Design an enzyme around this catalytic site. Structure first.
Site, PDB file in Angstrom:
ATOM      1  CB  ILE A  19      -1.010   0.058   1.167  1.00  0.00           C
ATOM      2  CG1 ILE A  19      -0.298   0.026   2.507  1.00  0.00           C
ATOM      3  CG2 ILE A  19      -2.042  -1.045   0.987  1.00  0.00           C
ATOM      4  CD1 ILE A  19      -1.154  -0.060   3.745  1.00  0.00           C
ATOM      5  CB  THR A  55      10.620   7.855   5.357  1.00  0.00           C
ATOM      6  OG1 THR A  55       9.441   8.666   5.182  1.00  0.00           O
ATOM      7  CG2 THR A  55      11.869   8.716   5.300  1.00  0.00           C
ATOM      8  CE1 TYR A  56      14.240   5.880   8.900  1.00  0.00           C
ATOM      9  CE2 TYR A  56      12.015   6.791   8.930  1.00  0.00           C
ATOM     10  CZ  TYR A  56      13.360   6.896   9.204  1.00  0.00           C
ATOM     11  OH  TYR A  56      13.835   8.049   9.790  1.00  0.00           O
ATOM     12  CG  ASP A  82       9.427  14.450   7.030  1.00  0.00           C
ATOM     13  OD1 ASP A  82       9.267  15.481   6.340  1.00  0.00           O
ATOM     14  OD2 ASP A  82       9.752  13.332   6.577  1.00  0.00           O
ATOM     15  CD  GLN A 115       2.942  14.177   0.432  1.00  0.00           C
ATOM     16  OE1 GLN A 115       2.848  14.659  -0.715  1.00  0.00           O
ATOM     17  NE2 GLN A 115       3.083  14.983   1.477  1.00  0.00           N
TER      18      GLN A 115
END
Length: 277
Positions: free
Chosen positions: A10, A14-15, A119, A123
């Site tokens: 899905i 970032t990681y 951050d 999104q």
């Protein structure tokens, strides 16, 4: 990890990749993220106890075969998708207000525990069909600089909770106008776009700014524009709120807790979004 059945990919976080999966013996449908340094293990463990209605629930942390898997609750979709879908008519004002308020609640909570997101962007905000909005991907592809606070971009290394208030004000402006507020494509472009709208910061509005690591005396000197031109048709209460979330000096920037008490939220409700499913 043999306990979960991957249903579908899905997202690409970032990681690590994020999948929708089903817990094989207990039946729950979850969001599974596959990301190990001991520090990371301790840090993530500490995120399991940071529970709030407006923070995506971190169900379990599986540290198997020397790798890390995070099991979260599963939601409907991200805010970026919703903003994109609503782009022709715009999100109703009462829903923007509802989402902003809940996000200030979640941040007031994090910030009271001395935890910052760092951050914030559309999104990493997730919504459900009932009208909830939650913070995601915090505490852990060219990444967007559009929501980054000015002290981060000027090289401040020990920035505060105020950077999350900056980012949220940027998101707030975008929900209202249906356009990114400061869409930079490089750190200097990001800084200059902020400077052109809010005026080049100096020692009057931001004591100590000129000492900051990446500050340059040669930065062009732009003048501040009005907020009436920046976020129309937002009403005065909303504009007064947004302007305080966008103060240059971090120590002047309104706090999440003070934001919740602003008059703009006097008539806040909890509408249901027009979603999919």
């Amino acid at each position: 990890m043999e306990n979960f059945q991957k249903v579908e990919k899905i997202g690409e976080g970032t990681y690590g990749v994020v999948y929708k999966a089903r817990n094989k013996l207990t039946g729950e449908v979850v969001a599974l993220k596959k990301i190990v340094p001991s520090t990371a293990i301790r840090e993530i463990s500490l995120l399991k106890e940071l529970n709030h209605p407006n923070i995506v629930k971190l169900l379990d942390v599986i540290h198997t075969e020397n790798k890390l898997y995070l099991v979260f609750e599963f939601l409907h979709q991200d805010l970026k998708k919703f903003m994109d879908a609503s782009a022709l008519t715009g999100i109703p004002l009462p829903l923007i207000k509802s989402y902003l308020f809940q996000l200030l609640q979640g941040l007031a909570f994090c910030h009271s525990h001395r935890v910052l997101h760092r951050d914030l962007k559309p999104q990493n905000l997730l919504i459900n069909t009932e009208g909830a909005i939650k913070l995601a991907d915090f505490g852990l592809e060219v990444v967007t600089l559009w929501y980054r606070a000015p002290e981060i971009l000027l090289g401040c290394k020990y920035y505060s909770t105020a950077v999350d208030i900056w980012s949220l004000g940027c998101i707030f402006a975008e929900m209202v106008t249906r356009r990114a507020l400061f869409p930079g494509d490089s750190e200097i472009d990001q800084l200059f776009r902020i400077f052109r709208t809010l005026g080049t910061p100096d020692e009057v509005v931001w004591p100590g700014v000129t000492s900051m690591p990446d500050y340059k005396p040669s930065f062009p000197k732009w003048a501040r524009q009005d907020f009436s031109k920046v976020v129309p048709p937002l009403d005065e209460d909303g504009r007064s709120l947004l302007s305080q979330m966008l103060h240059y000096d971090p120590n002047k920037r309104i706090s999440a807790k003070a934001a919740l008490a602003h008059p703009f939220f006097q008539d806040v409700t909890k509408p249901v979004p027009h979603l999919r499913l």
